[PDB]
Copies of this chain bind each other. A is one copy, B any other.
Amino acid sequence: CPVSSYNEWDPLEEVIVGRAENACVPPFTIEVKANTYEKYWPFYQKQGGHYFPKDHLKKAVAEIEEMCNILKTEGVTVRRPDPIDWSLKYKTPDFESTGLYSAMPRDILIVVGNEIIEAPMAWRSRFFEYRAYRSIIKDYFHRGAKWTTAPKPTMADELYNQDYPIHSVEDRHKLAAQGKFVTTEFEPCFDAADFIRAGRDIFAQRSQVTNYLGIEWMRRHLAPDYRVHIISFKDPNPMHIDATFNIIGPGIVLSNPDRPCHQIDLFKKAGWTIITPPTPIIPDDHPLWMSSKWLSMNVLMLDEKRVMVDANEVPIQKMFEKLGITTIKVNIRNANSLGGGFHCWTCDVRRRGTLQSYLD
């Protein structure tokens, strides 16, 4: 029973850690544009289809190897996806594209109990991302784990709002208010990172890449043992929930100050502790091609009292320390450029614990 994880904090025993090798800038299509900060459009426009800066990839490779050494030191068994050249152009009857990477296991895999679920994805450059993880998943399957792949979308034009106000407009907030994003409700789609686990309760957010159809598929697939709840935040470009509402312990959550939860009272009524982390100190000149600066709160819990946090983000380190949580500092400044922190770069396969309710 290699697979067994019910939440984000029980004693970590096994984890999968992504790879920065052969990562490619994704073609600049509507859904990529919707996620990209104006500051990087020219980069995407000129680099699409080519590898991310190799000198940069080399620094990320080194940073992740160290993180892996540290995880092993902390007693965690580490598995890595297979190396793949993401520049291969593939063609389905609906579209043609080059790949992205297998840097973020959290984006595509989620473990609920003894079951590993592969998310369908919503980006054309991520259609075949599951190929990097099949060697690991087949091994767990041979060893007794449940293996599920949610319905893979066609990703035909109909899935995208070709006329979304990507070009900047901010009333994306207005559409967002209506739960309307770059992805339509044409077919189910979602990134696993839009779901965060707390035992019997899983919280999901409708985002640029996760539609209500996708959430309903998860809800229906997991019922009645698990309850999937939808929550929303003030955010004009949501993609993944773990840098917005990161649950770090039973009844404790890190809420991004810039992205308040519309349903925060549900948690306050449940006796939950909402902690708002201090702002990130990452320089504005450092390239974050795929995300915001909020990767600082994208921490990974080794257990309730041990957290893997960025070495450079001292303010948030102090915060954890005042709470009695031991900080294991690792530097992943260059890996952050690819779009993720510790929670994103990993997928907890096995945590020592049982299925419980923390919402009463």
- Chain A positions within 8 Å of B, measured between CB atoms, are 21-22, 57-62, 65-66, 69, 82-85, 87-88, 251, 265, 268-273, 275, 322-325
Contacts and interface: CB of A to CB of B under 8 A. Distances in A.
A271 to B, nearest CB: 3
A195 B324 CA distance: 33
A155 to B, nearest CB: 23
B273 A21 contact: yes
* Of A65, A271, A322, A325, most B-chain CB atoms within 10 Å: A271
A62 B270 contact: yes
A273 B82 CA distance: 12
Contacts of A268: 62, 65-66, 69
Contacts of A21: 273
A88 B36 CA distance: 44
Contact of A83 (B62, B271, B322): B322
Contacts of A88: 324
Nearest to A61: B271
Contacts of A273: 21, 61, 83
12 contacts: A22-B323, A58-B251, A58-B271, A58-B272, A59-B271, A65-B269, A66-B268, A82-B322, A83-B323, A84-B322, A85-B322, A87-B324
Contacts of A61: 271-273
A-B interface, 10 closest residue pairs, ranked by CB to CB distance from nearest:
A85-B324, A58-B271, A62-B271, A65-B268, A61-B271, A85-B323, A84-B322, A62-B269, A21-B273, A59-B271
B22 A324 contact: yes
